[PDB]
Amino acid sequence: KVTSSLLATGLLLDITSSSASKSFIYDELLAKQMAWGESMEDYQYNVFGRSGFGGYTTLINAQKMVESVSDDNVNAYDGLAHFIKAYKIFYMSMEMGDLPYEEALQGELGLVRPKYNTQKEVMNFILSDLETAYELFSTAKDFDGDPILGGSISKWKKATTAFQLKVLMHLSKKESDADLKVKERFARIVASGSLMESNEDNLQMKYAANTVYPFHNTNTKHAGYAMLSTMLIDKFKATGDIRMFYYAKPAKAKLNEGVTADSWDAYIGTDPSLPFEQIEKAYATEQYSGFNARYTDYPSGEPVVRLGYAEQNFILAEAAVRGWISGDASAYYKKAIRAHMEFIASNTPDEEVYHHGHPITEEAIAAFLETPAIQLSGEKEEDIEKILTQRYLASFMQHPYDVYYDYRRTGYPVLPINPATNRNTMNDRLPMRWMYPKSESDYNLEHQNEALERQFGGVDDVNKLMWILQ
Numbered sequence: 235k236v237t238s239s240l241l242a243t244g245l246l247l248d249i250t251s252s253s254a255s256k257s258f259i260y261d262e263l264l265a266k267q268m269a270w271g272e273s274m275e276d277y278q279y280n281v282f283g284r285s286g287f288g289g290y291t292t293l294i295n296a297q298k299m300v301e302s303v304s305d306d307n308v309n310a311y312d313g314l315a316h317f318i319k320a321y322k323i324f325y326m327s328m329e330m331g332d333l334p335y336e337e338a339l340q341g342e343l344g345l346v347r348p349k350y351n352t353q354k355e356v357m358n359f360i361l362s363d364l365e366t367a368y369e370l371f372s373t374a375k376d377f378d379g380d381p382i383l384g385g386s387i388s389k390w391k392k393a394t395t396a397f398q399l400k401v402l403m404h405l406s407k408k409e410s411d412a413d414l415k416v417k418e419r420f421a422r423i424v425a426s427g428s429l430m431e432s433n434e435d436n437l438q439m440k441y442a443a444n445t446v447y448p449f450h451n452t453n454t455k456h457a458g459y460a461m462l463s464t465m466l467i468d469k470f471k472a473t474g475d476i477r478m479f480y481y482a483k484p485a486k487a488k489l490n491e492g493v494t495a496d497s498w499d500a501y502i503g504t505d506p507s508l509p510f511e512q513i514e515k516a517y518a519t520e521q522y523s524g525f526n527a528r529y530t531d532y533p534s535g536e537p538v539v540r541l542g543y544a545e546q547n548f549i550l551a552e553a554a555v556r557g558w559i560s561g562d563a564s565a566y567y568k569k570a571i572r573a574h575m576e577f578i579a580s581n582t583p584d585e586e587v588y589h590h591g592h593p594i595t596e597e598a599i600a601a602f603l604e605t606p607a608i609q610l611s612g613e614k615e616e617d618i619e620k621i622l623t624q625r626y627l628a629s630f631m632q633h634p635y636d637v638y639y640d641y642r643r644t645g646y647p648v649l650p651i652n653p654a655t656n657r658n659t660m661n662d663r664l665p666m667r668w669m670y671p672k673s674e675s676d677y678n679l680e681h682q683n684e685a686l687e688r689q690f691g692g693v694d695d696v697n698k699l700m701w702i703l704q
């Protein structure tokens with residue numbers, strides 16, 4: 235029937251799975267890393283609606299998992315329980331703002347209409363749940379039912395640390411808050427927790443027991459509509475970044491004039507802020523660069539990462555520039571860039587169909603890391619921009635919605651926005667949150683309205699700023 239192991243698998247697949255459909259690239263569209271040639275898409279032109287409370291349904295399952303532990307290793311699974319709770323609620327609050335925390339399980343069980351905690355309270359509870367998760371794993375033994383990190387306590391301690399530092403960096407606008415102690419807790423975890431040691435520590439989904447990358451040919455007919463953005467192609471060309479050749483394939487209209495696949499000029503970025511009819515004309519005449527073949531014709535594609543070694547190092551770099559920790563910003567930054575380049579190389583065959591004549595070799599990595607154009611200058615805003623831009627580029631097809639969250643938090647990289655095409659109700663910007671699910675005004679109206687009055691003066695609005703963004 236139902237064992238702790240089987241439930242663990244369920245929860246873990248939930249956190250790491252992707253859809254084999256268009257929705258996979260909705261966050262790439264929001265972050266402006268690509269346009270979509272099939273039709274005018276909401277997430278390309280910045281139209282938000284409501285998000286969901288589906289995440290809370292995992293609470294009952296996590297509790298059953300812990301109650302069901304049949305050996306003496308309850309701390310392992312309880313550690314997982316606390317990690318999954320924090321993670322799921324973290325992402326819901328990132329989407330929407332205040333929501334239930336204290337009363338969430340009671341609400342799921344139908345015992346109450348659950349009060350909404352303030353987002354500050356939510357973030358504090360998330361951080362306390364992660365400290366508990368770290369202490370639980372620390373006093374636990376390896377466990378069964380984990381296909382992502384193999385039930386390895388050492389790996390779970392690193393995943394918990396990694397998420398702790400990600401959550402704390404997302405609280406950067408709240409560095410002054412008296413009670414949240416963001417800088418202080420970030421430094422303490424860096425000194426006392428378990429930092430990742432390599433790309434082997436990534437919490438990710440790898441493809442190809444009998445399962446293919448979400449945009450393989452066998453899973454979708456729609457990957458062909460992807461049009462890589464100027465935000466990738468122009469940044470790559472400007473810095474001689476050979477990752478362009480692994481992200482993209484040549485524009486067919488360039489190949490037809492005799493421009494070769496190894497040439498930088500064969501690749502065309504599409505500005506996703508242009509009127510859709512212009513985008514459609516560029517798509518029909520093949521004046522655009524689509525996905526590299528590794529995403530679409532290569533069964534294992536690349537792992538889809540939630541928590542990674544490169545990522546953690548871009549977080550450490552930003553913390554260093556912000557003065558949260560004492561280490562050298564530039565060294566973290568270059569570790570991060572190197573880690574992403576090695577990640578690509580490790581997960582891509584050395585064949586022309588994938589690298590187009592520019593293989594990622596150790597010499598290419600070493601050369602790129604010392605490119606003058608990407609060096610940190612020691613001017614704070616310029617350095618945060620560089621770290622966030624390299625992080626943006628390294629997170630194409632990765633870390634669902636995180637790029638957009640870092641954009642909200644820092645304003646980087648600056649995205650293409652066109653008043654005459656932007657379909658948000660404010661022309662000049664992206665929306666800053668989703669609305670709450672309709673089910674909350676159907677069954678928990680009073681508590682939801684208290685929260686809407688407190689946060690926004692009463693209206694559930696996509697252009698209002700949640701607390702962590704104020």
Ligand SMILES: [Cl-]
Pocket residue numbers: 388389392435
């Ligand atoms: Cl480990």
Ligand SMILES: [Cl-]
Pocket residue numbers: 508509510511655
């Ligand atoms: Cl349009």
Ligand SMILES: [Cl-]
Pocket residue numbers: 261262264265634635636637638639
């Ligand atoms: Cl994103």
Ligand SMILES: [Mg+2]
Pocket residue numbers: 257258259260261262631632634635
């Ligand atoms: Mg995506």
